[PDB]
């Protein structure tokens, strides 16, 4: 097995329409607290939480973080993003990255982008017609 | 044929990965000014523009607005949202809805929700792995 810097154990809860992604660290999972992926997309806001690891979580795969760290610090130069944290994420940066190289704001920007993007990637392509737009619009309002 | 109040003529530009939705009024189309739908979702910002109707736009379906008007009114009354307008949208509210009943803000909130939701609905489900999350992460940093 080759040398690796800090990895991310990417996992998901299967919500049928989409997969809700998280990063496993030890016995906990960092994740966006969203119930609905299109809700996050429409509101422009996403908050991290931390929950207990359970057997409902499925490992998607163990990925290198190196690429993302280099790419992130290249591009996101003290920029704003849509992510924040709840009360349970005091050690999120150190926990995920194993270092204080990244600030909390950077850590959650990078990881938030990963989790929301993965969620979005996993969404089932749905026909758009008068019926389905009503269905999803109705869901967006509730 | 049947009594209708103001209808929406929904249309799209087919962008392969997603369909980019618009509302046609006469010879113009109101649409989100974005060429990357996951980027819109990640940034929490979407801005309307108006372009000239072209033969590239595919008519999806003519849908009733009534349901959406009543639902929006009763649900997200004066809630802030992610939508704004560019210089070309001065008459967007009147053009789309026929009357001054909705403020510019309620109108773009309603129509925005519809267009972004439809756009997201249409996105091709993509496997999530080290390769693809890098690809989509990479796009999200541009
Ligand atoms: Na999709």
C-alpha pair distances (Å), A10 with each of A64, A83, A99, B131, B133: 10, 18, 18, 13, 11
- In B26-84, where does DSSP find H-type helix? 37-43, 66-75
Beta carbons within 10 angstroms of residue B77's beta carbon: 8
DSSP 8-state symbol, B47 = E
* Chain B residues closer than 8 Å to A118 by CB: 128, 133, 136
The resolution in Å comes to: 1.9
The CA distance from B109 to B125, in Å, is: 26
Residue B113: name the closest of A100, A43, A122 by CA: A43
Contact A82 B130 (CB under 8 A): no
Q: What is the DSSP string of A100-131?
A: SSS-HHHHHHHHHHHHHHHHHHTPPP---SHH
Residue B20: name the closest of B93, B123, B129 by CA: B123
Query: Collapsing DSSP states into helix, strand and coil, what is residue B66?
Result: helix
The CA distance from A84 to B101, in Å, is: 36
Ordered by start, the domain boundaries in chain B are 7-140
Question: Is the minimum CB–CB distance between A30 and chain B shorter than 8 Å?
Answer: no
Contacts of B23 (CB under 8 A, 6+ apart): B8, B9, B10, B11, B29, B30, B31, B96, B111, B114, B115
Length, in residues, of chain B: 142
Contact A141 B114 (CB under 8 A): no
The CA distance from A114 to B136, in Å, is: 9
- Antiparallel, parallel or unpaired: β B83-85 and B46-52: parallel
CA nearest to B63 within chain A = A130
Residue found under tokens 């993302």:
A68
DSSP 8-state symbol, A79 = -
């Amino acid at each position: 097995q080759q040398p690796q810097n800090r990895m991310m154990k990417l996992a998901y809860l299967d919500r049928g329409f989409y997969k809700h992604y998280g990063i496993i660290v030890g016995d906990h999972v960092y994740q966006l607290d969203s119930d609905d992926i299109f809700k996050t997309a429409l509101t422009g806001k996403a908050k991290f939480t931390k929950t207990k690891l359970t057997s409902d979580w499925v490992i998607e795969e163990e990925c290198e973080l190196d690429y993302f760290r280099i790419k992130y610090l290249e591009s996101a130069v003290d920029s704003e993003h849509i992510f924040s944290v709840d009360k349970n994420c005091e050690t999120i940066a150190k926990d995920i990255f194993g270092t204080h190289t990244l600030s909390q704001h950077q850590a959650i920007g990078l990881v938030g982008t990963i989790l929301l993007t993965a969620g979005l990637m996993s969404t089932i392509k749905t026909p758009v017609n008068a019926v389905t737009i009503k269905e999803f619009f109705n869901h967006a309002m509730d």
